[PDB]
Design a binder for this molecule. Structure first.
Ligand SMILES: O=C(CO)[C@H](O)[C@H](O)COP(=O)(O)O
Ligand SMILES: O=C[C@H](O)[C@H](O)[C@H](O)COP(=O)(O)O
Ligand code: NA
Ligand code: NA
Lengths: 218, 217
């Protein structure tokens, strides 16, 4: 079973939750990109999409799917996105692809967050995959010092700039004993724009694809 | 003459500049008078860190060397203004829209010298609005969340920060617990930073008035 095939199964399983005339928030990454291909097939049935990254926006426009600005939306019934790690509670680590900031923003406007993953993203405990932290560029060294004080090990993602013009520190070895408190503790640091811990905005449903099929972990 | 007062406060901060220091420099009209004072002692300065692109342009135009904050580990002094300040050293900042890099530089600096004319001194913070810097696509969302905190956000139309973001100027927030307020703004997704300076206080508050400059703190 190709990894591609599991991602396709999970993508198609999210399609079943799309109702006519919805505005659809779309996440980022390779699993989401198979979902974009599924959305193209039913794009006459929906109104528009909100894009969590410029890459996602380009892919949606290439399919002829209308894209609209989040500020022109107050009611977003569904957000579909992948994750780097997800557990049965629906807590996630996101940001491997560097889009965690707009991802968290769209996810917070959306009523229902559908997380689509193959089985390798499911973990019993969060924390092995690093936490991407988006940082104002001139604050890089200061923020890294503050993260070390929190017991994290930050690694600058060389050469990468986010959609928002910032850099990423990928942080290893943080404690996830209290993940909501951890998510806040990063964000209150001057120069931190956002971080990849999704503990305050959980996935409402977690669709996990394996060889047997797609399982609603949540 | 508010300008005369601002000049007095600026000169009073110059007395804290020692030889071979790297000097962090704030933003705004009071700081711009201090930039003119700094020019007169260029020979004494190693370099300055700039809290805004505008401040960098003013420093470079005086021939004052500018270095990037990521290259600095020892930043002994930061000199900045404020929109409001109390004797505790809590401040509202961001009237000029530079509050994000200001707070970053302030937090690297050892000593924060706040320079103000008398009109900036308040017993209770809160009359001047709190500038909140927001990821542009998150604007309406952040506004809705700020309304839930009891604030009235007003989009600063046409303005873009040094970081490519927009400002909501927020009125009527409760300052009963200023540090918790500062945090509650910064945890909202899409908020980059806000103008409440309650976790990083001014270490010295130099207040210019008719009678001279008084160290409120
Ligand atoms: O925080 C600031 C800009 O972001 C300024 O320091 C503040 O607005 C005070 O400026 P001025 O001295 O012109 O009153
Ligand atoms: O910013 C990146 C997002 O968190 C992605 O949704 C996440 O990295 C999952 O990506 P993929 O489906 O390619 O594994
Ligand atoms: Na922050
Ligand atoms: Na935030």
């Amino acid at each position: 079973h190709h990894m591609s095939e599991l991602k396709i199964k999970a993508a198609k399983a999210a399609i079943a939750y799309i109702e006519d005339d919805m505005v659809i928030g779309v996440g980022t990454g390779s699993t989401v990109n198979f979902f974009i291909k599924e959305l193209a097939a039913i794009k006459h049935k929906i109104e528009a999409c909100v894009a969590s990254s410029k890459a996602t926006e380009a892919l949606l426009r290439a399919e002829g799917i209308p894209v609209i600005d989040l500020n022109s939306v107050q009611d977003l019934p569904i957000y579909v996105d992948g994750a780097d790690e997800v557990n049965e509670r629906g807590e996630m680590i996101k940001g491997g692809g560097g889009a965690l900031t707009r991802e968290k923003i769209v996810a917070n406007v959306a009523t229902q967050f559908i997380c689509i993953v193959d089985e390798s993203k499911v973990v019993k405990r969060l924390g092995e995959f690093p936490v991407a932290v988006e940082v104002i560029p001139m604050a890089r060294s200061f923020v890294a010092r503050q993260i070390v004080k929190l017991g994290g090990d930050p690694e600058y993602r060389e050469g990468f700039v986010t959609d928002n013009g910032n850099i990423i520190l990928d942080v290893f070895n943080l404690s996830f004993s209290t993940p909501m408190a951890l998510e806040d503790s990063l964000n209150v640091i001057p120069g931190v724009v956002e971080n990849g811990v999704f503990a305050k905005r959980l996935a409402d449903k977690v669709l996990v694809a394996s060889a047997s099929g797609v399982n609603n972990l949540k």
